[PDB]
Amino acid sequence: MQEAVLQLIEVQLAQEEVTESPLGGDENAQLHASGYYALFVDTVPDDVKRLYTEAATSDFAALAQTAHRLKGVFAMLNLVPGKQLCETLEHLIREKDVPGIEKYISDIDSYVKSLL
């Protein structure tokens, strides 16, 4: 050991990336802090209960417009998973999957319930 002898390491806290931890921090608290919580309890639950009501009548036209509305407002709130639910909702309407539609309506209801 005359040349290389001994090293401390090779990179020394380098060549690493702390780009872990995906979605999930305090998004609901963030939306509360911004003040958009007012909207969250204004038109959102109204569209949700309407979703339920229009689903009962099987008014896919109204289901679609509200799914798109929710997709837009969730995208506005920057809620990706929420907008995703609305995305699948519109797809379920296109496929005429009634049980799927109501399932996702319930999933959005449960979603909104936990975020409210």
| Side chain identity at residue 107, one-letter code | D
Asked whether the beta carbons of 55 and 73 are under 8 A apart, the reply is: no
Helices in the chain by DSSP H: which ranges? 27-34, 37-40, 44-57, 60-77, 80-94, 98-115
Angle (nearest 5°) at CA 18 between 15 and 19: 115
Fold of the 1-116 domain = Four Helix Bundle (Hemerythrin (Met), subunit A) (1.20.120)
Question: Which residue ranges make up each domain of the chain?
Answer: 1-116
The technique is: NMR
Residues after which a C–N gap over 2.5 Å breaks the chain: none
Number of Cβ within 10 Å of residue 95's Cβ equals 10
DSSP string of 22-37, one letter each residue: -S-SSHHHHHHHHTTH
